[PDB]
Curated annotation (Swiss-Prot), chain B:
Name listed for the protein in its UniProt record: p51 RT
Recorded consequence of changing residue 149 to F: 10% loss of DNA-directed DNA polymerase activity. 22% loss of RNA-directed DNA polymerase activity
Residues noted as binding Mg(2+) 1 in the record, renumbered to the chain: 106, 181-182
Species annotation: Human immunodeficiency virus type 1 group M subtype B (isolate BH10) (HIV-1)
Gene: gag-pol
Phenotypic consequence of residue 215 to A: Complete loss of RNA-dependent DNA polymerase activity. Complete loss of RNA 5'-end and 3'-end cleavages
Effect of residue 212 to A: No effect on RNA-dependent DNA polymerase activity. No effect on RNA 5'-end and 3'-end cleavages
Effect after changing residue 179 to F: 70% loss of polymerase activity. No loss of polymerase activity
Length: 554, 412
């Protein structure tokens, strides 16, 4: 007997205020019982479970399911109730590594460690809560009672406890062997290195020797798994990665579900296939919520899909990360609030790609969208590579400077450079900071009756020019905007406009270049055509002449 | 050698706050720091049976090349039972804001000498993440009072109280105030001796049992405050008068006696904006009366210790920023203006981050607590970058303003 180090148990507790499960065992057929008795007999002989006295008051239902119509049976202990009462654990699985962040490896060996799983003892004081009962033949004797000694499959804490136990064992090996990487997924350990293969195989034997100190043995065979690997929807190869085959189905008619499925595939594909578009297809799902409801494909969407099938025509792979080189992120504007990007280190060899869609909102502008895309890429990059990439953006350095020095909010974009690839992001208009000498002054105003919804919009100018237009189905806010629009329409290339609308100023000072309001869009089109515009604000109902509210008070 | 028991507020469980993305440089710094803290018994590795978490990151104090671990205990602090100390509540020192000089000292290290109640340790869990989540995050929990936690100064108070008795009895005029990991020491002394007392103080602390070498000098006596001012001109255009009436209309919400009727009269008619308008005597007198009203303090302004302090900031351009601190709208308790060049000639966001720390510091000195900020920036931009420029050991709360306030210019 060679002494082995025991595996420390994790102390587990039920949620505060809760007791163990007391669920009634289900009636089973004579056939299933003999099967369960046989099954439990060896488990017991194997140390996994132990017979318990009548004292224990807890219970969990055990079942028997035939195996794909085999000669064998399998036991299923349903821990759903115990799981609802078991404490929460730290789940280290959240946020999986992204392939573009991985490093290329010459070799990646796989080791089966499913057996090690049963060397992990379950906290002695929690064992009682795992009690179960194999009914007796004909219910004429007491059912056989057992409780677990090891992590039960299906129990809430098994995955976290198994992983943390294996990690603690592996820790010193990883630390003292910096030339290898170890990753656990399910019942396997994946060990990779760039070592001359002889030395790599030696490292594997050392790992098996290390694990034996806890009496954990490994198959001593050549695991079936070898590069490439199918993992979390990706294909990992020694020096490249890609997403698993994306197949867009041919269809004569699509339903809400089919489209949600399609968009899911396109989104997954967009991380390496450049240009993928999903706006025209996504908007079709605007409040449908009926999986079966067949929706007709707009010609706009039929076009987007055809463009995507083209992009998905042939396989595309991304390369792995080389810590010794800079990271570059290039962005392009696609239109309709869509943006696309590529992250690479060497020209034409993307590590990954991606897209960004503008946020929901009444008014927006291209510079703000570009900024949001930059922030999103920056954060993703910190997660995957731990650093910010250098950016290549379709906006002139001069345009950016004019924008941020004049914008009312603080804003920032990290180290970047202009890349001249249309369409370029630009500022479409810029209001004056001071009144224009020589330019006609338009005093505008609008008002609407809250009940009748009737209103008026208009202006009076220093040259005696005047206009008042009657409006229906309107509000104070819309008449205020209409008044400004009339002034822009009827003035020359330079104009001074005086308004008392805090609402209209709130919008224009936000500098939108596009809006969900056709009225605001018409105003933007006029601002773009003018040479100079000064917009002045004054308090309403304060006896400021030109403030011709009277014309619109009827 | 013994620990004072601690518990969470009734009906509240420990924090479970996600760890945000960390740069490679900050991860390496934290791995090195925690490895030494673990060896010294300050923290211990934890198992999967601890599901709690508080974010951690790293910073560099004002001009220091050495990384400092900083745990964001904002959540734990609002969930940790109010630790009213034996002090019955040390009345905030009103004299601190009046001192000629105030140095800020980082005494957070002292905390690590006092053990933390074993049953509360689980709630201080934190994670050092790995780049691309390639390896399991390193999990730890504190065994001693942690820096940044609300209950640390509270529990260490009694120890600090007697640690300073000597220095305090021999210097009964010096004001010493403690907020979280910082010690504020103020005295009217000539900056040269003021410093002697300070360095003496830390040598008096280092000897007493405990990077305390750093110092941060503030001058409350030379602090920023702002009255409302109107333009003085020889020729007023229609536009100048429109801007004045607008500003006066805004001010009338703060000062009840403000009038614009006589000035508004000048604006009757549809005149060219650049046309010069001569002021009548009635309008001139009205402007004069308003100027006088604006030289008097605001009526009914008082601080209430049970109410939150609110701080608003406006970007004025060219590196200038204005701000106001109040509890009730239009009842400003403090207003100010900054224009600073520590490193952000061309970085809006660094400037705002520095303005936020300066305002918080002023707030701690004056009222002994931090304000809630209304920041003129998009949430995404702020959250992506503020930690890159942070240099304080505390962290205030903040919210975002997405609509341009019309009152921007009136404050500059
Ligand atoms: C996340 C991960 C998943 C698997 C695999 C899980 C599965 N199935 C295998 C390993 C070894 C790792 N860990 C790391 C860590 C750093 N670089 C890499 N690079 C890397 C990994 C696999 C291949 C290949 N072929 C090439 C390079 N892998």
């Amino acid at each position: 007997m060679v002494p082995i180090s025991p595996i420390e148990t994790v102390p587990v507790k039920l949620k505060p205020g809760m007791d163990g499960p007391k669920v009634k065992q289900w009636p089973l057929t004579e056939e299933k019982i003999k099967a369960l008795v046989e099954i439990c007999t060896e488990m017991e002989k194997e140390g996994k479970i132990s017979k318990i006295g009548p004292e224990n008051p807890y219970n969990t239902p055990v079942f028997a399911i035939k195996k794909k119509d085999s000669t064998k049976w399998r036991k299923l202990v349903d821990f759903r109730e115990l799981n609802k009462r078991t404490q929460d654990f730290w789940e280290v699985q959240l946020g999986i590594p992204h392939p573009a962040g991985l490093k290329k490896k010459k070799s990646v060996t796989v080791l089966d460690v499913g057996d090690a799983y049963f060397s992990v003892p379950l906290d002695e004081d929690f064992r009682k809560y795992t009690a179960f009962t194999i009914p007796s033949i004909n219910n004429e004797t007491p059912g056989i009672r057992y409780q677990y000694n090891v992590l039960p499959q299906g129990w809430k804490g098994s995955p976290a406890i198994f992983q943390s136990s294996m990690t603690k064992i592996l820790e010193p090996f990883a630390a003292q062997n910096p030339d290898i990487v170890i990753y656990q997924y399910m019942d396997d350990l994946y060990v990779g290195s760039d070592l001359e293969i002889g030395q790599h195989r030696t490292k594997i034997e050392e790992l098996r020797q290390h694990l034996l100190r806890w009496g954990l043995t490994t198959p001593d065979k050549k695991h079936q798994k070898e590069p490439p690997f199918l993992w979390m929807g990706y294909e990992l190869h020694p020096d490249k990665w890609t997403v698993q085959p994306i197949v867009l189905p041919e269809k004569d008619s699509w339903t809400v579900n089919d489209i949600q499925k399609l968009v899911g595939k396109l989104n997954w594909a967009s991380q390496i296939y450049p240009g993928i578009k999903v706006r025209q297809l996504s908007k079709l799902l605007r409040g449908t919520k009926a999986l079966t409801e067949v929706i007709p494909l707009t010609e706009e969407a039929e076009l987007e899909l055809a463009e995507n099938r083209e992009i998905l025509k042939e396989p595309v792979h991304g390369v792995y990360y080389d810590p010794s080189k800079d990271l570059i992120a290039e962005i392009q504007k696609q239109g309709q609030g869509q943006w696309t990007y590529q992250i690479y280190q060497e020209p034409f060899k993307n590590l990954k790609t991606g897209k960004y869609a503008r946020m929901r909102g009444a008014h927006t502008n291209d510079v703000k969208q570009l900024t949001e895309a930059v922030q999103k890429i920056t954060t993703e990059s910190i997660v995957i590579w731990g650093k910010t990439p250098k950016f290549k953006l379709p906006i002139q350095k001069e345009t950016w400077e004019t924008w941020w020095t004049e914008y009312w909010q603080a804003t920032w974009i990290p180290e970047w450079e202009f890349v001249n690839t249309p369409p370029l992001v630009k500022l479409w208009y810029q209001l004056e900071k001071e009144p224009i000498v020589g330019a006609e002054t338009f005093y505008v105003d609008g008002a609407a009756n809250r009940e009748t919804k009737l209103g008026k919009a208009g202006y009076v100018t220093n040259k005696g020019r005047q206009k008042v237009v009657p409006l229906t189905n309107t509000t104070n806010q819309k008449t205020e905007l209409q008044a400004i629009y009339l002034a822009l329409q009827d003035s020359g290339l330079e104009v001074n406009i005086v308004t008392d609308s805090q609402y209209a100023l709130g919008i224009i000072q936000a500098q939108p270049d596009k809006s969900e309001s056709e009225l605001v869009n018409q105003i933007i089109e006029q601002l773009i055509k003018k040479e100079k515009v000064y917009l002045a604000w004054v308090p309403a109902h304060k006896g400021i002449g030109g403030n011709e509210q009277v014309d619109k008070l009827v | 050698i013994e620990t004072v028991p601690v518990k969470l507020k009734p009906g509240m469980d420990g924090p479970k706050v996600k760890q945000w993305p960390l740069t490679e440089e900050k991860i390496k710094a934290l791995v090195e720091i925690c490895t030494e803290m673990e060896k010294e018994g300050k923290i211990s590795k934890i198992g999967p049976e601890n599901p709690y978490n508080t974010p951690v990151f790293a910073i560099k104090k004002k001009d220091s090349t050495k990384w400092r671990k900083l745990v964001d205990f904002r959540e734990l602090n609002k969930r940790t039972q109010d630790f009213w100390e034996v002090q019955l509540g040390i009345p905030h020192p009103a004299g601190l804001k009046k001192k000629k000089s105030v140095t800020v000292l980082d005494v957070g290290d002292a905390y690590f000498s006092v053990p933390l109640d074993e049953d509360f340790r689980k709630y201080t869990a934190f994670t050092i993440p790995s780049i691309n989540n390639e390896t399991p995050g390193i999990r730890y929990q504190y065994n001693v009072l942690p820096q940044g936690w609300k209950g640390s100064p509270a529990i260490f108070q009694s120890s600090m109280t007697k640690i300073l008795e000597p220095f305090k009895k021999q210097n009964p005029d010096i004001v010493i105030y403690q907020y979280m990991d910082d010690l504020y020491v103020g005295s009217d002394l000539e900056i040269g001796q003021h410093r002697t007392k300070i360095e003496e103080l830390r040598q008096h602390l280092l000897r007493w049992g405990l990077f305390l070498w750093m110092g941060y000098e503030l001058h409350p006596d030379k602090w920023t405050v702002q009255p409302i001012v109107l333009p003085e001109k020889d020729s007023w255009t229609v536009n100048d008068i429109q801007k004045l009436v607008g500003k006066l209309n805004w001010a009338s919400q703060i000062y009840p006696g403000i009038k614009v009727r006589q000035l508004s009269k000048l604006l009757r008619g549809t005149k060219a904006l650049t046309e010069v308008i001569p002021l009548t005597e009635e309008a001139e007198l009205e402007l004069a009366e308003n100027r006088e009203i604006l030289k008097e303090p605001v009526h009914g302004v008082y601080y209430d210790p049970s109410k939150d302090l609110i701080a608003e900031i406006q970007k004025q351009g060219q590196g200038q920023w204005t701000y106001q601190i109040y509890q009730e709208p239009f009842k400003n308790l403090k207003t100010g203006k900054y224009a600073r060049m520590r490193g952000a000639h061309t970085n809006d966001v660094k400037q705002l981050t520095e303005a936020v720390q300066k305002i918080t510091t002023e707030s701690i000195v004056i009222w002994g607590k931090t304000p809630k900020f209304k920041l003129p920036i998009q949430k995404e931009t702020w959250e992506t970058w503020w930690t890159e420029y942070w240099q304080a050991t505390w962290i205030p709360e903040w919210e975002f303003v997405n609509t341009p306030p019309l009152v921007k210019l009136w404050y500059q």
